[PDB]
């Protein structure tokens, strides 16, 4: 009931035309501002009460950003393209002590997106599904968020099958990258909290705010 993939694609195109860890954290902070503008362009998000908009973004920002830089890097060999225009090569990540998580991103997300040629509309819908997370604690009306999520995947499935009729399992394949995104998202947060604890590794204000309690 009013969740056109065209609007979701527009939201995607609207927001995106020596320690690698520091560069990664700087890109993350930068992208958090852009993430807010993205969400506002997702149908019905802005109509939710402000408190729930805050809960949803605080609950999904890490997965939302990871999905974005992962898809952006499908053209990249063994590396990730940051929003800042900088590239982090697998070797660079490894030499910085963050090779394990880097490899998970390349193998579980980037390579899979590249192999199935996930398009921007599909990426946008998957992020919209993550955004509308009904399991987020504190939601004033979880049923409402769940309803929006359902409208997104209903539209996503219609898009698939019509766009890729010859791939009946495509819709399921897309949803099945969400568990990987959730796991990788959690590991990335663990790294961030450790960086904050250890000190060093500058962490800007918005990224820092996301690390605030809860």
């Amino acid at each position: 009931e009013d969740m056109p993939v065209e609007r979701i694609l527009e939201a995607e195109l609207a927001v995106e035309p020596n320690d690698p860890v520091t560069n990664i954290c700087q890109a993350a902070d930068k992208q958090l501002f852009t993430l807010v503008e993205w969400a506002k362009r997702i149908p019905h998000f802005s109509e939710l009460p402000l408190d729930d908009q805050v809960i949803l973004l605080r609950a999904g920002w890490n997965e939302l950003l990871i999905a974005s830089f992962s898809h952006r890097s499908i053209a990249v060999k063994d590396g990730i393209l940051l929003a800042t225009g900088l590239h982090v090569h697998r070797n660079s990540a490894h030499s910085a002590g963050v090779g394990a998580i880097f490899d998970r991103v390349l193998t579980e997300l980037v390579s899979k997106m590249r192999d199935m040629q996930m398009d921007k509309t599909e990426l946008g819908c998957l992020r919209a599904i993550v955004l509308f997370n009904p399991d987020s604690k504190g939601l004033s009306n979880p049923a409402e968020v769940e309803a929006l999520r359902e409208k997104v995947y209903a539209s996503l499935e219609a898009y698939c099958k019509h766009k890729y009729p010859e791939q009946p399992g495509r819709f399921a394949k897309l949803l099945l990258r969400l568990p990987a995104l959730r796991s990788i998202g959690l590991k990335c947060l663990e790294h961030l909290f450790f960086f904050k604890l250890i000190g060093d590794t500058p962490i800007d204000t918005f990224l820092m705010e996301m690390l605030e309690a809860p």
């Binding site: 506002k40 805050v54 973004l57 705010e209």
Partner: peptide, 11 residues
């Protein structure tokens, strides 16, 4: 709490 996010969503 969450000063930045609120300001950005409201504006």
């Amino acid at each position: 709490k969450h000063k930045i996010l609120h300001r950005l969503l409201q504006d």
